[PDB]
Design an enzyme around this catalytic site. Sequence first.
Site, PDB file in Angstrom:
ATOM      1  N   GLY A  29      -5.020   3.485   7.201  1.00  0.00           N
ATOM      2  CA  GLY A  29      -3.958   2.530   7.522  1.00  0.00           C
ATOM      3  C   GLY A  29      -2.717   2.630   6.653  1.00  0.00           C
ATOM      4  O   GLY A  29      -2.680   3.391   5.683  1.00  0.00           O
ATOM      5  N   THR A  30      -1.706   1.832   6.998  1.00  0.00           N
ATOM      6  CA  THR A  30      -0.419   1.846   6.292  1.00  0.00           C
ATOM      7  C   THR A  30      -0.544   1.205   4.911  1.00  0.00           C
ATOM      8  O   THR A  30      -1.504   0.494   4.634  1.00  0.00           O
ATOM      9  CB  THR A  30       0.703   1.124   7.075  1.00  0.00           C
ATOM     10  OG1 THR A  30       0.426  -0.278   7.154  1.00  0.00           O
ATOM     11  CG2 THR A  30       0.864   1.699   8.481  1.00  0.00           C
ATOM     12  N   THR A  31       0.438   1.460   4.053  1.00  0.00           N
ATOM     13  CA  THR A  31       0.397   0.973   2.676  1.00  0.00           C
ATOM     14  C   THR A  31       0.771  -0.514   2.617  1.00  0.00           C
ATOM     15  O   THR A  31       1.681  -0.963   3.315  1.00  0.00           O
ATOM     16  CB  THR A  31       1.326   1.791   1.750  1.00  0.00           C
ATOM     17  OG1 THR A  31       1.125   3.197   1.974  1.00  0.00           O
ATOM     18  CG2 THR A  31       1.043   1.477   0.281  1.00  0.00           C
TER      19      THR A  31
END
Lengths: 243, 244, 111, 235, 241, 231, 195, 240, 250
Positions: A29-31
């Site tokens: 997933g994204t940060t």
Amino acid sequence: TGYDLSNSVFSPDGRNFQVEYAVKAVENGTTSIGIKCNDGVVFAVEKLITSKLLVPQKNVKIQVVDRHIGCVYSGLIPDGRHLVNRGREEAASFKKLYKTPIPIPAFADRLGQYVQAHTLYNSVRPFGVSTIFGGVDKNGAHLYMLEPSGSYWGYKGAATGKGRQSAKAELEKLVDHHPEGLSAREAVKQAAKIIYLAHEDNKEKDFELEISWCSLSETNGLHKFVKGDLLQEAIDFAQKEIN
Amino acid sequence: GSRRYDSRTTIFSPEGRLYQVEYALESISHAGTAIGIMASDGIVLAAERKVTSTLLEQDTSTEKLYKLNDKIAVAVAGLTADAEILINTARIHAQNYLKTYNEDIPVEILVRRLSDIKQGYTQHGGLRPFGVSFIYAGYDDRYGYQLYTSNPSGNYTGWKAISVGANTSAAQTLLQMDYKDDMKVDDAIELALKTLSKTTDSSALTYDRLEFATIRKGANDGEVYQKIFKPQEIKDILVKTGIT
Amino acid sequence: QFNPYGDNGGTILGIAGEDFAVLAGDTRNITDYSINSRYEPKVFDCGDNIVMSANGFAADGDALVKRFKNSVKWYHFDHNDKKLSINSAARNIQHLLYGKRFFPYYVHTII
Amino acid sequence: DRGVSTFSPEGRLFQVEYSLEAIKLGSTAIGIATKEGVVLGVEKRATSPLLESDSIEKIVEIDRHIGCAMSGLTADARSMIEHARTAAVTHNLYYDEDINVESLTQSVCDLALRFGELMSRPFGVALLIAGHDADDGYQLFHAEPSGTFYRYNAKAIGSGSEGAQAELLNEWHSSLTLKEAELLVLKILKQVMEEKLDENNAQLSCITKQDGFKIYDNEKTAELIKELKEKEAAE
Amino acid sequence: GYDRHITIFSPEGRLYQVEYAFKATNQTNINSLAVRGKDCTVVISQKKVPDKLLDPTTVSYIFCISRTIGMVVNGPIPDARNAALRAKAEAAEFRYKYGYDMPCDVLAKRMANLSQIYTQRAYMRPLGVILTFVSVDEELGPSIYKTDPAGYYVGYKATATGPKQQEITTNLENHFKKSKIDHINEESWEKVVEFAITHMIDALGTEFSKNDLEVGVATKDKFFTLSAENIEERLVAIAEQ
Amino acid sequence: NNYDGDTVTFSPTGRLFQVEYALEAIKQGSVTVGLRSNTHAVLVALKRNADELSSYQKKIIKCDEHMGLSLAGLAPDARVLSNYLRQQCNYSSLVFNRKLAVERAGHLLCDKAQKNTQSYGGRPYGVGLLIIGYDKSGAHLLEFQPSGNVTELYGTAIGARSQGAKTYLERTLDTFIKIDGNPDELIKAGVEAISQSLRDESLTVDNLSIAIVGKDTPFTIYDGEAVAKYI
Amino acid sequence: MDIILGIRVQDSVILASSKAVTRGISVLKDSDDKTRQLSPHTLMSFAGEAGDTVQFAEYIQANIQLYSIREDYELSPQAVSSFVRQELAKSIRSRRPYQVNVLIGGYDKKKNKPELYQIDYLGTKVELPYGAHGYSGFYTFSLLDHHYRPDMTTEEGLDLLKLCVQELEKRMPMDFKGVIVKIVDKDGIRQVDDF
Amino acid sequence: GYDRALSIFSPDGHIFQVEYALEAVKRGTCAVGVKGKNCVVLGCERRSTLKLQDTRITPSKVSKIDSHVVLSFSGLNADSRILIEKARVEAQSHRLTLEDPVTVEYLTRYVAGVQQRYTQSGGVRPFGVSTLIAGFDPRDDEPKLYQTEPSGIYSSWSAQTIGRNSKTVREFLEKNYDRKEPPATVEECVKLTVRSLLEVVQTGAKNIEITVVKPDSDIVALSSEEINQYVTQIEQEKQE
Amino acid sequence: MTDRYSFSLTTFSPSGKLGQIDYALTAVKQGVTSLGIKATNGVVIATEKKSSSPLAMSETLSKVSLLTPDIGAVYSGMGPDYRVLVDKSRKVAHTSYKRIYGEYPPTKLLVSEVAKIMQEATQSGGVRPFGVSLLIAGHDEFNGFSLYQVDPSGSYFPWKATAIGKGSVAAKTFLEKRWNDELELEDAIHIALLTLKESVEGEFNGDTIELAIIGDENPDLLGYTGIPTDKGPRFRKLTSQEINDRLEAL
Ligand SMILES: [Cl-]
Ligand SMILES: [Mg+2]
């Protein structure tokens, strides 16, 4: 073998492979990050702009619990929403019975126990999110990070997602260089920088920055989104540092 | 989920057999032999205890023969623990009937209900069947003396003489040879013991490895008496027929 | 003891012509000897050229109208936007009313 | 084994796709919709000559204005018909009117996917639901165990379906009379049926606005069979 | 081999899931120790905070179950907290139902019975934790009772748990051979804590700073944990002797 | 492979294969397009038939006077989800006298789809939805995926060959967004968008399905001779 | 409902039951049969609350007929009476009890003996030579105490019954429109058409 | 509760559990139903590997559901009791609410519906039983004979057989039974039923059961000697 | 969520074996040796206290447990399974007997109730059998003294004397030589200690051996006086000192 096919099954190591497989979904997933400051906390997240067709500012990922707690997460977004929905029910029943708003450590264990419960049975799947959350209560500011296993600790700074190592390294420098403390307005600017620096690990698609914060002085102890002039000021600060 | 670990106890084979019922019958074939013989003036129940130890308390013991009510008894072959669950149910069913109609339960009705319970475990619930075969010996005023058997399938049938448990093939041949319809109880007693004595896996048949019972009209005038034989009474009947 | 009913007064009147129909009602709402409102409408357009009023106990009247309006809405969803005929509406209202046979809506309904 | 409600890698429910194979094994059923009425016809397919063919009930009344023909595991259709009949009568009770053919079909199709781990498996039967209402007129619907229904001008289901459907494609036009449609069902049934078509091994029915849903007698169908054979020999 | 996935018997009469839960116990790589004084019961545990970003005050494997009972856990923190919350609820309910504070040994038994259920019932997994309960019981005096994933429990004169448990165990065994008694013959709890730390230093062979340790102390009518400065004061006393 | 038996199982790389297979059912489904301006929101859907004798499967469903969606994939699953939306829209009206925000509509669908991906026995929804609506904050378009992910967009498309229409809308973004106070022109842009996903077949009278909602326009669907204007 | 009588003689049981069904100030019917055949040799007459009586009678009838089919065997009058008593004994502590009083007249084929059982709505069972429910008993019991003999024939029992009906027709306030009489013996159940 | 879907579809479109239940029926003892002009006869095989039986008390193969309808079966004996009990309860329930005994068709339709329910209910297996249901409707002299099977399908038959070697006896009945002229009398109908069982049975001693059902609840089971007379008569005519 | 294991985990194999019961019996075989001997005026039950660690207080762990004032129990196999069985056995003695009849159940019936509990774990959904064999010694007025063995299957057998667990085969042979029908209680205690020394390897004293008797009534252990009919528990656990006294004259 076959120990990894079913949730809640111990491997011969003593490990629950299904939980470790959920961690892989989180790493994909994204940060997202969290920064503890003098009198509060700051949250920030990377939103990948998949297409021009995405409406800017209108796919909000950071969620509020009660009025004083902020939650952000990386991994399976629906799983994160399910966890916040539970968090809101937990916070509502606490306030209903005990009058006072739920303390952050109390709230942290409510999520912890619920996530941990999803590692006890083969009829449920572990959560595919690591959740960074926190806020301000009677005892001051608290930042937490919760993982698929149900494991959570208090943090000075927290990071998760695809650019977690880059963000962690940058967070560690802030802790070293500011032993007396970091201010709320500073933490917002630093949060922007760290998301921009952590975007180097996800640089195919360009992104949209989203920040929120709780602070005893700046937001009066309530959770608010950083918007308008203060947001653009933080973006400009981050743009100047990458170059 | 849990599907992974389900044995599926209540399914058909490709041949149209119930796996668990067939394997429960295989279990029962290793249990101590039990014989029922129905005479014109009574019924005999005889059963062989499973490899006895010399330090086993024999007189205060009950493994094979159980009393359901004053008129009906059963001989067990299989898991004792399973049989006791079913026996207590059967005992209760008999008292429910008596409470409802103010009459002792007809033998077949009790047998049918107990057999219907076993049937249920083969068709639904996902549980293992009861690893038990019964020989029912009883009396009522409709059919008089009756012998039945039931097995884990929940199927029951009526008999003049029958064996369950181990060596039933050999035991049934011997009963089929010497049995006749005008037979008395005392003759049936002798036939029961002679059959066990030949079909036994033990070296010699002794009093301490047997349970015995009769259901006669040998009480005083038009009433039935159940006699569960004591150790000394089995010892005497074994000498009287010339086995020891 | 708690009495779940009340009387909000008022009166209504329905007349049918050859190619039209009227449903009238006064706009006064009362409790005992006090006036609550001089203009509180109780005759409503429910859609599909059906007008309705449920006079008596206003809370039960409002609840019933609200339920029938909602009934019309779901009739459209479930039956391809078909127009609810006045006879079909009437029968639907019978079931609404009778559904509370043992705790009635204290209203006289006219459509 | 594996879950009952499991998706395949192609994005289809295994059990639903397997139930469709069961329906292909079933006896042929044909429906044709016209402006004068909707005709429903079925292959009875008696397994033995000793079986009394008039007891084979594969065409069924739901209400006076809605009929139904089936194909596949026909035992599974009983609870579907029961539900349809109750839905039709219940709607009449609540609304003092006939229920729309589409709404009836939709109510039946809501049962279809109520299976899993509700019933243990999908239905192994497809239904042709024919009817009439004031709004959309004469209608024919094909209700599957997937929960999906399509309206059709004409439709064949069962073992001879793909061969019969191709035949219906050519033969159907928007100006068909009822008599023409009756013969067309008989014609196409005779083509795809294994045994030779007669009044005992095939059954006709129709639904008209005036007379409602009617299953034809063996005497009436026999005359239509005789009329059909003469017309094919006439050119 | 599905007899290794759920809690049913293997052909040799073993529950593999229970055995693998025991191996999860050492996943944290922390060693704990518990000893009894005259008036008190001391429990100590290693505290390892590897990440610099962690708030070290929130990193803890010692729990205050009730006012009188303390609990240290060897195992992963989610299962540790699961067990702690349940123990807290059980101790509270006990007090309400029976009108007196739940004893350490009774709570240990209750938690052990719960653990036993997970070894017999299939749908519930065992918790991968070893729970060490400590108190100064009003009837039995200083008490140490320990529970494991098998549902086993027993009282202890002293005990240790963790990867290097055996080294600590023998170190304590040799002391009680020498002293000829069941406890630490010491008046103040401060010196019993000093004993506990000293003998852990000798057994493990490592030196400890104030942030490397975590200390829990049970006295009559209260159990409490020590702060970093309370431990530092205690470490200074050992060093100056 | 070994991790696609049910939705409760993660793969070693952290994937949910049953959810991905449900996503595959959408790709097999017929194309549908969504787009909006500031005043109106439009759905355009290519309907599919079994054969020439059959009807064309209806793709667009009305949820309230101010909201509705188009579907792609399993139609019965769209019926379940649209029915849930109808109830939620209706609950908001009866209890709060409030039209349901299109954003909340999306949040509710996300949470409903999610529960089916974390529990044993159930299955994911096998359908993708494009929700349009006009509420207190103007026109809206949402894209629902049965993974749970809901996304607010200016324009989009889902189904087979939806990449053609999605690229077109990505180019046309600046044009169609400013079609304010003009329904017919916004529809034309949508009809031109869906045309980029056509192969061999073209848009006929009983093939095309269009829906629109806006400032002074209730959610209304156009089929049959009513869409002949736009061919 | 109101008048139900029963007389057990040497070889039979005779049940007399009033024909009137009254509601309010109207006799709705004057030919009502207040009885059900439970089995070929067992008859049950009934009286009590409107609706309850028939509902109960038919429920018992269904259960006895079910038993008969299952076992291919007729239950004894004693067994049927015990079953009926238990149903009433359950009923009395229910939310809404059956307010029904019954007489069960049967011929036991195994004993070759007639049997009459009187059971009230509480589940109070008694075997009697003669029985009655309601206000009827206040006249008939004393009359039968005097005139009844245990060795009487069926014809003597019918004359004894005529004597009861005459007394009830003389002294009862209500017009009960005469009685339907039925005899239960070794040959089964038959109705006397001219009474 | 135990929920498992035991009866499910396979790739080829078959429900194996229902088909394996038919194999249990094929294993069961043969049963035959033949209907004449004014009667129906139910014939049943009884396997002769069981001697020392008590035929007084052993469950009979033909069961009365009501005074005017009977049910025989082939397959699992324990399973058949459950269907018979339910059918008997429904028969009495029908009399109670409709004030009329069941038709043979209605009773069959009920039993068949129960069998069907067990093919798509969770946690249960199908009944390993096929039934022959015969009788006469109330106030009707037309004979009725129906068949049911595990799947839940049912149908009417002029004559039919089920169980082991049923395909042999069905072959016999298919040529020997004339639709235009069914067995005019009771004797003719019983003889044809006994003849058809003699193709399969072994000996005509205590292996054949015969039950004759006539209109207006007139059901009687034949004894050994009565059946043996048919066996003796058929064999003497055969030697030709 | 919820217990989805509603099906049997113990099933019949093709050979007719119930695998889980057999494997439970294997677990009992691994367990420490325990034994029971019936005398004319009493019963003795005994076992070794296998200490897990020398730091562990073996007094706190009780292998021999009081079920009623006149009934005691000991086991071989899995200790936790035993502990919960004792809890359930104590409770069932009250709920299914004492609360109905106002008196404690006779040995055979309490044994029957324990057996029922263990049988249900052999057939019920989502559970394994208990991994223990029990020896239950007890006294009641109408049956006198009795000794029973209860296995994982739920089967129970009455014994004059027996042993279970590790060295049961040798221990049973030893008991066959020494047992007679005229044994006094003290003679049975003596034989119990002799039999147990064979199976025990390490230390053999009152601190490593657990031993209890069902003998005469103990008015001193009752806790009160005034009711003549109440004479005190027949179950008594021998103290560490009481065992060592008998080990000198061994
Ligand atoms: Cl407990
Ligand atoms: Mg009375």
